Amino acid sequence: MQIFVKTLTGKTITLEVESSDTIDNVKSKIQDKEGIPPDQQRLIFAGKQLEDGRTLSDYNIQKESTLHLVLRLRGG
Amino acid sequence: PGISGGGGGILDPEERYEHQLRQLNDMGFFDFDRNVAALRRSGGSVQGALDSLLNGDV
């Protein structure tokens, strides 16, 4: 399984996860790709702001799904 | 009363904010009219519009 994560600036990241990864665990992968700290960022799917303790399965996330990330300080 | 101001075709929100409109759509908000009404009050912030869209302010 993989997923993708898209900034508010417009960059698309790609990550390797399982349906059992948490939202926290997903944020923590982007820190390998751009260095963005997982306490500064949040995630969005179907316009809804996702909760840190939930899974990818909790939002019915699929392989190659195209999610977004949101920094609490904007960063752009 | 006393809202809005001057402008022209080159300044309408459909092209003033076309990046942010796409970013809202790509996150999940295909309601163009709501996105426009939200960007108009957020000041053109993607997440500022997103907060209004979530709260039902548009």
Q: What domains can be seen in chain B, in order of their start residue? A: 7-58 (1.10.8.10)
Residues B22 and B5: their CA atoms lie apart, in Å, by 25
Residues A68 and A59: their CA atoms lie apart, in Å, by 14
In the block, which residue shows the tokens 């195209």?
A66
Q: Can you give the length of chain A in residues?
A: 76
Closest CA to B28 of B9, B54, B2: B54
* Paired strand residues for A70: A42
Way it was determined: NMR
Residues within 8 A of B (CB atoms), A 5-64 only: 6, 8, 10, 44-49
Give domain A1-76's CATH number out of 3.40.50.2300, 3.10.20.90, 2.50.20.10, 1.10.645.10: 3.10.20.90
In the block, which residue shows the tokens 């999610």?
A67
Residues of A within 8 A of B28 (CB-CB) are: 44-48
Are B29 and A47 an interchain contact pair (Cβ–Cβ within 8 Å)? yes
DSSP H helical ranges for chain B? 13-16, 18-27, 32-42, 46-55
Closest CA to A68 of B29, B23, B19: B23
Are B54 and A48 an interchain contact pair (Cβ–Cβ within 8 Å)? yes
Is residue A22 a contact partner of residue A53, using CB atoms and an 8 Å limit? yes
